[PDB]
């Protein structure tokens, strides 16, 4: 993994994220939603587990993006949890949770759930 | 379970649901959100697994409520998945998924996730 993870990944909706997997489990990079402008680039930080098994198992990882940058503040944060699978067709299969800051009465509807698959192509 | 399940349950937000657990795993009843009016009563249907283990394990179950009745159509449905635990303080601990009908472009944000704990008190 690690080396295999570092690079650019694209999901099915048009988002891109570039990440560096450091020697001791760190993941650091940027997530860009669309257009191709600095305005849709947000910082991402996460971790991956740097000594994955040798039975062809995926590498468990996760990262968070807070949706605030210098052009936008969407008062929300998204975390992606999943695993990296390398090889010919490497992919990161994830499930995500997006929480928006709400008032206490609207807290019950503050989190959306979805999934995303990222590829290098 | 079964017998223990049949009855009225209340969650932490003020909702109530009355359900009948039939001999062969069926769950049928009504879910009422608030006020105490026919208008907030919706049909619920689900299933429970009628031969649960004997190591004190909970009874797995689930039910669905479509948010449409004669006074309201909220174009959405909620499913609750969890387990019933009996005894002095019986409760049904659940995690739920609420999906609203969306257009294909908004499908990525069509499902909310949460949790609810129901008691007899």
């Amino acid at each position: 993994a690690e080396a295999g993870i570092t690079g650019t990944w694209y999901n099915q909706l048009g988002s891109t994220f570039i990440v560096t997997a450091g020697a001791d489990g760190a993941l650091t990079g940027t997530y860009e939603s669309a257009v191709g402008n600095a305005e849709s680039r947000y910082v991402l930080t996460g971790r991956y587990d740097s000594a994955p098994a040798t039975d062809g198992s995926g590498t468990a990882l996760g990262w968070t993006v807070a949706w605030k940058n210098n052009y936008r503040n969407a008062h929300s944060a998204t975390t992606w949890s999943g695993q990296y699978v390398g090889g010919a067709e490497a992919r990161i299969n994830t499930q995500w949770l997006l929480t928006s800051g709400t008032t206490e009465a609207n807290a019950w509807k503050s989190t959306l759930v979805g999934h995303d698959t990222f590829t290098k192509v | 379970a079964e017998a223990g399940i049949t009855g009225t349950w209340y969650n932490q937000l003020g909702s109530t649901f009355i359900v009948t657990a039939g001999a062969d795993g069926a769950l049928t009843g009504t879910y009422e959100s608030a006020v105490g009016n026919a208008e907030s009563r919706y049909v619920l249907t689900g299933r429970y697994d009628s031969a649960p283990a004997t190591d004190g394990s909970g009874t797995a179950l689930g039910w669905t409520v479509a948010w449409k009745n004669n006074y309201r159509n909220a174009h959405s449905a909620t499913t609750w998945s969890g387990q019933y635990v009996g005894g002095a303080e019986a409760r049904i601990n659940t995690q739920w998924l609420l999906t609203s009908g969306t257009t294909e472009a908004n499908a990525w944000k069509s499902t909310l996730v949460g949790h609810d704990t129901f008691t007899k008190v």
Partner: peptide, 8 residues
């Protein structure tokens, strides 16, 4: 037009 969606 949440930043996690397309476009924006």
């Amino acid at each position: 037009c949440h930043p996690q969606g397309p476009p924006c």
